[PDB]
């Protein structure tokens, strides 16, 4: 379920947004619009849990939220080569793609996966620099990792193959 | 050497550039903003085959023109999501990192090969839905990662711990 997700949240995001402003403030001004990308996912997988699977073309219109913050994401590393936490902004803007797991099938976790692996090119760096001198860039790293490790196991169990729509419910080219 | 980096632009980034306009404008703008910093990153070259390496703060300096032109890969990828060419301007804008391999010890070639692994999680899509039906999306993607390829290579060869500077050379700050 929807608080399946929340608890990988409040288990790892919280203390990662947290580090993040405590890091840089341009650190902390990516990470919340990751956070917001994360609200916007939540609220997609409870819409999935209650609407039958919509067509391609109005799947591509609620997903515009989620890659708006993206482009926000990569903005802000792209136009800050010399901030001395690069390797911070470049393991979210090189990995923020995990967020259409929502649209991939069947292989969500997988895609997933390959996200994470492209966060841990840059969070590898963070952790040889700093390992042993600044604990909150390695709590910082733990947390942005293990998030994505366990995102791709809730998918695993709970969207196996693709986002769980459901085929009794109501119509996704919907809200509220 | 110039002219060996070079001869990869004219085996695969020239014919690639003809078919990037050819399959749709947003993608021939894309490229055009990658060759020019690749045209950046020869004339780099050109002088750290004439200069002697340059103190930490001058490198960060003399990279700044290849960075702006993968800025702006990017922007184009990212504000062009309704693209029907989406996976082409994401094979570019999440592999443009493959450039900084300038600045990378003692693996400039493992960092191209992350970088292609990037690309290709793009051009196996592409692939996978146009070969037999596209040749030119197929042609694409094989100079793109030819060229990936071929600089792995190039690398190996050439710069094989880093880009060679010249410990007899001049100041990389200015010229003859
Ligand atoms: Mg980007």
Same mark, same amino acid.
């Given at each position: 379920?929807?608080?399946? =997700?929340?608890?990988?949240?409040?288990?790892?995001?919280?203390?990662?947004?947290?580090?993040? %402003?405590?890091?840089?403030?341009? $650190?902390?001004?990516?990470?919340?619009?990751? $956070?917001?990308?994360?609200?916007?996912?939540?609220?997609?997988?409870?819409?999935?849990?209650?609407?039958? +699977?919509?067509?391609? *073309?109005?799947?591509?219109?609620?997903? +515009?939220?989620?890659?708006? =913050? !993206?482009?926000?994401?990569? +903005?802000?590393?792209?136009?800050?080569?010399?901030?001395?936490?690069?390797?911070?902004?470049? !393991?979210?803007? *090189?990995?923020? /793609?995990?967020?259409?797991? $929502?649209?991939?099938?069947?292989?969500?976790?997988?895609?997933?996966?390959?996200?994470? /692996?492209?966060?841990? =090119? #840059?969070?590898?760096?963070?952790?040889?620099?700093?390992?042993?001198?600044?604990?909150?860039?390695?709590?910082?790293?733990?947390? #942005?990792?293990? =998030?994505? %490790?366990?995102?791709? %196991? #809730?998918? +695993?169990?709970?969207?196996?193959? /693709?986002?769980?729509?459901?085929?009794? /419910?109501?119509? !996704?080219?919907?809200?509220?």
């Amino acid at each position: 379920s929807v608080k399946e =997700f929340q608890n990988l949240v409040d288990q790892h995001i919280t203390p990662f947004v947290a580090l993040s %402003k405590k890091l840089a403030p341009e $650190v902390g001004n990516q990470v919340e619009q990751l $956070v917001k990308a994360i609200d916007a996912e939540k609220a997609l997988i409870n819409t999935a849990s209650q609407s039958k +699977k919509p067509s391609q *073309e109005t799947l591509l219109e609620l997903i +515009k939220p989620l890659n708006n =913050f !993206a482009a926000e994401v990569g +903005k802000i590393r792209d136009s800050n080569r010399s901030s001395k936490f690069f390797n911070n902004l470049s !393991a979210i803007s *090189e990995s923020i /793609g995990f967020l259409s797991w $929502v649209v991939v099938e069947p292989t969500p976790g997988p895609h997933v996966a390959e996200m994470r /692996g492209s966060a841990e =090119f #840059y969070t590898n760096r963070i952790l040889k620099e700093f390992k042993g001198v600044n604990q909150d860039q390695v709590d910082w790293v733990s947390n #942005y990792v293990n =998030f994505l %490790k366990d995102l791709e %196991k #809730y998918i +695993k169990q709970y969207h196996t193959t /693709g986002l769980t729509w459901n085929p009794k /419910g109501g119509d !996704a080219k919907s809200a509220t």
